[PDB]
């Protein structure tokens, strides 16, 4: 049916049963176009940001986010999330005598 509780442009039934994005709108999933390349998405129909990141379920699912983001994070269940660390390579010591 068509009622949108979290107001993120994916209906509740589609969110709880499975959907995909075609021409930048959500459409009810059908097993026939898994061969055409489409992936099945599922989300929380009571949350806009299911994964907790700054992008809604529709923004992640439809790819309409930063294009440098991995295609992994185009799933509303996987969070777009950077893991940054630092590594030291050598140390210099200036003895001010």
């Amino acid at each position: 049916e068509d009622l949108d509780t979290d107001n993120d442009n994916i209906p509740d039934a589609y969110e709880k049963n499975g959907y995909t994005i075609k021409d930048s709108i959500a459409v009810k999933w059908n097993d026939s176009f898994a061969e055409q390349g489409y992936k099945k998405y599922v989300s929380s129909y009571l949350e806009s940001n299911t994964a907790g990141d700054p992008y809604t379920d529709y923004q992640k699912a439809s790819g309409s986010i930063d294009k440098a983001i991995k295609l992994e994070a185009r799933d509303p269940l996987v969070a777009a999330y950077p893991v940054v660390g630092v590594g030291m390579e050598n140390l210099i010591i200036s003895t001010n005598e």
Binding site: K16, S44, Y45, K70, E72, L77, V78, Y81
Partner: protein, 102 residues
């Protein structure tokens, strides 16, 4: 995913245990590993860039509470594969790809 030459850290959303209002969809650990690394599957195999990361061909490592959950839930389940338990919150999995393996 500790390939040996690299490392890839992921975060997959999991449902809160008690709350009846947490409508996050439940998935197994194997589906989470497939979604988090966009691995392509081949029958029962699960291929990363070129590397198999299916449960038989890796070395999983958990913390104490994750190992407790998974051991607890392997018994009350059938088909005792760790890729069939389903991803509670706070789990910590580390997939080590083996150096030599035939």
């Amino acid at each position: 995913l500790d390939t040996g030459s690299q490392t890839f850290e992921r975060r997959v959303a999991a449902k809160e245990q008690g709350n009846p209002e947490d409508k996050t969809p439940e998935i197994t650990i194997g589906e989470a590993i497939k979604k988090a690394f966009s691995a392509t599957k081949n029958g029962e195999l699960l291929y990363f860039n070129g590397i198999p990361i299916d449960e038989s061909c890796v070395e999983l490592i958990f913390d104490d509470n994750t190992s407790e959950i998974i051991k607890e839930q392997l018994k009350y389940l059938d088909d005792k594969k760790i890729y069939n338990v389903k991803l509670e919150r706070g789990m910590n999995i580390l997939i080590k790809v083996p150096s030599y393996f035939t």
